[PDB]
Design a protein around this motif. Structure first.
Motif, PDB file in Angstrom:
ATOM      1  N   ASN A 156       2.589   1.760  -3.356  1.00  0.00           N
ATOM      2  CA  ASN A 156       1.576   2.333  -4.230  1.00  0.00           C
ATOM      3  C   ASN A 156       1.237   3.780  -3.840  1.00  0.00           C
ATOM      4  N   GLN A 157       1.510   4.115  -2.582  1.00  0.00           N
ATOM      5  CA  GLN A 157       1.407   5.488  -2.094  1.00  0.00           C
ATOM      6  C   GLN A 157       2.592   6.293  -2.614  1.00  0.00           C
ATOM      7  N   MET A 172       4.326   5.797  -5.181  1.00  0.00           N
ATOM      8  CA  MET A 172       4.190   5.920  -6.633  1.00  0.00           C
ATOM      9  C   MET A 172       3.338   7.111  -7.080  1.00  0.00           C
ATOM     10  N   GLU A 173       2.480   7.587  -6.183  1.00  0.00           N
ATOM     11  CA  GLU A 173       1.609   8.724  -6.470  1.00  0.00           C
ATOM     12  C   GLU A 173       2.279  10.076  -6.179  1.00  0.00           C
ATOM     13  N   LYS A 174       3.125  10.123  -5.147  1.00  0.00           N
ATOM     14  CA  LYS A 174       3.947  11.304  -4.877  1.00  0.00           C
ATOM     15  C   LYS A 174       5.069  11.401  -5.903  1.00  0.00           C
ATOM     16  N   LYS A 224      11.880  13.622 -12.610  1.00  0.00           N
ATOM     17  CA  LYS A 224      11.789  12.168 -12.540  1.00  0.00           C
ATOM     18  C   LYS A 224      13.170  11.544 -12.638  1.00  0.00           C
ATOM     19  N   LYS A 236       4.562  10.496  -9.397  1.00  0.00           N
ATOM     20  CA  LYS A 236       3.996  11.002 -10.650  1.00  0.00           C
ATOM     21  C   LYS A 236       3.920  12.534 -10.630  1.00  0.00           C
ATOM     22  N   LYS A 237       4.027  13.107  -9.431  1.00  0.00           N
ATOM     23  CA  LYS A 237       3.975  14.553  -9.237  1.00  0.00           C
ATOM     24  C   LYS A 237       5.370  15.170  -9.085  1.00  0.00           C
ATOM     25  N   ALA A 271       4.831   3.444 -15.383  1.00  0.00           N
ATOM     26  CA  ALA A 271       4.748   4.883 -15.146  1.00  0.00           C
ATOM     27  C   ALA A 271       5.858   5.692 -15.822  1.00  0.00           C
ATOM     28  N   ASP A 319       0.829  -1.200   0.000  1.00  0.00           N
ATOM     29  CA  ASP A 319       0.000   0.000   0.000  1.00  0.00           C
ATOM     30  C   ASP A 319       0.867   1.255   0.000  1.00  0.00           C
ATOM     31  N   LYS A 368       5.506  -1.235 -11.332  1.00  0.00           N
ATOM     32  CA  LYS A 368       4.863   0.061 -11.182  1.00  0.00           C
ATOM     33  C   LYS A 368       5.641   1.123 -11.954  1.00  0.00           C
TER      34      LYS A 368
END
Ligand code: ZN
Ligand code: ZN
Ligand code: ZN
Lengths: 81, 360
Positions: B31-32, B34-36, B43, B38-39, B79, B28, B75
């Protein structure tokens, strides 16, 4: 005064082995004269080294550096040492 | 620093400092993470840091869980394409071929030659792993048998390959006879080398070690400062500043025979303090150069496509395509184009001013 080796865990990098003992710019042996000095026939033709550890006759790598700036053999700009 | 700290954070989660992390909940939090991600703007900085980080884990078996590691690679690939997770997956496959390779070397030895020590080696493909050449290290005699015996073994394995030993990443285990007790020292290969030196004399100067181990002092100094941390070695003054007192080529080093420790197997192979800086600086230079390569790549994808284009139109396309991985600086793409001409991938249309054309 005595230490012994029980274990040793080594790490190595494998690559293809390219034997370049020529000058990349004029194409003949580094250890002999450059193309331009054999044009002049008969100590002042040395080999220059770069931070990249690549070596070329100092004479060639100059003429070459007249029109270009990134080491004939890599992607970085040429730097003496 | 934000995209870097996120990677360092991932290391935290997927690294084992011996304490087991609940499996499911980390899925989890991955996957958390991974969201911070994409922002994130740069990269590509996260990538370099997360690879070099996945590197240290693989090489030292220091990986919290075999499953989590590849979980993050599915992931990340989803991405940022397969460019982003190309070298990554190759490192996993590399560690595996290495595992298989090692055994294949034990058998060949099992039937033929003797081994004075328990040898174990990880060959890695010179391209994928973010590591660098050692520091002109002079090989101790006992290890040398395992060196030549393997280098020669490998020559048989492959046609035109070559091995480049990374001693600054190699560790091993010493066993002590010269102390009150019987200790098993877990020491870096630099350490081992200076310790084996005290199998004759019991004191040398900083200048005598640099001559017998070929260790550049810069790195020899930081090492001795660890060998003085543990009371294994000591100097004439048993009171000096353990941290601030820099050494000199003439300062002596003494084998402390009064070595005492509350445990039988010690770890003297600790990360020295100048490491989390020096390795950071080098990774930054590798990023700066990596961007330059990415760009040349773009310039060629684009020029290859539209056989002719004006400088300004080129710049704009290059920004468009790279915008998703990072925020390119204009002067750089200028330079990349220029280099690309010196390389003969594209030329200037004579007559035309700043119009370039791809050289098929
Ligand atoms: Zn030449
Ligand atoms: Zn010459
Ligand atoms: Zn070079």
């Amino acid at each position: 005064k005595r230490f012994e080796v029980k274990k040793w865990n080594a790490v190595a990098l494998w690559a293809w082995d390219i034997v370049v003992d020529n000058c990349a710019i004029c194409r003949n042996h580094i250890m002999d004269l450059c193309i331009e000095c054999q044009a002049n026939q008969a100590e002042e033709c040395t080999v220059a080294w770069g931070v990249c550890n690549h070596a070329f006759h100092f004479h060639c790598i100059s003429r070459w550096l007249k029109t270009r700036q990134v080491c004939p053999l890599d992607n970085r700009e040429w730097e003496f040492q | 620093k934000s995209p870097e700290e996120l990677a360092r954070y991932c290391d935290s989660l997927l690294k084992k400092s011996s304490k087991n992390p609940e499996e499911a909940e980390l899925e989890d939090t991955l996957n958390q993470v991974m969201e911070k991600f994409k922002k994130i703007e740069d990269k590509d900085v996260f990538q370099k840091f997360y690879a070099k980080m996945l590197a240290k884990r693989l090489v030292h078996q220091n990986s919290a869980s075999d499953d989590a590691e590849a979980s993050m690679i599915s992931k990340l690939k989803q991405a940022c394409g397969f460019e982003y997770t190309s070298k990554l997956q190759r490192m996993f496959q590399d560690i595996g071929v290495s595992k298989d390779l090692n055994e294949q070397f034990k058998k060949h030895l099992t039937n033929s030659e003797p081994l004075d020590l328990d040898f174990s080696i990880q060959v890695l493909s010179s391209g994928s792993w973010p590591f660098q050449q050692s520091c002109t290290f002079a090989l101790p005699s006992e290890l040398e048998r395992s060196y030549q015996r393997f280098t020669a073994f490998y020559a048989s394995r492959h046609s035109g390959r070559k091995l480049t030993w990374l001693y600054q990443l190699s560790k091993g285990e010493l066993v002590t006879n010269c102390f009150k007790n019987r200790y098993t020292l877990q020491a870096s290969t630099f350490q081992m080398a200076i310790l084996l030196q005290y199998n004759t004399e019991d004191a040398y100067t900083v200048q005598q070690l640099t001559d017998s181990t070929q260790i550049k002092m810069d790195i020899l100094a930081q090492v001795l400062q660890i060998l003085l941390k543990s009371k294994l070695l000591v100097l004439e003054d048993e009171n000096a500043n353990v941290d601030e007192v820099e050494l000199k080529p003439d300062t002596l080093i003494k084998l402390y025979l009064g070595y005492k420790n509350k445990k039988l197997r010690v770890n003297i192979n600790v990360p020295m303090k100048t490491e989390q800086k020096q390795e950071q600086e080098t990774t930054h230079k590798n990023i700066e150069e990596d961007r330059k390569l990415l760009i040349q790549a773009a310039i060629v994808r684009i020029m290859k496509m539209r056989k002719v284009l004006k400088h300004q139109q080129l710049l704009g396309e290059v920004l468009t395509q790279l915008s998703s991985r990072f925020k390119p600086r204009v002067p750089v793409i200028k330079k990349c184009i220029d280099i690309l001409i010196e390389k003969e991938y594209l030329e200037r249309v004579d007559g035309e001013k700043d119009t370039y054309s791809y050289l098929a």
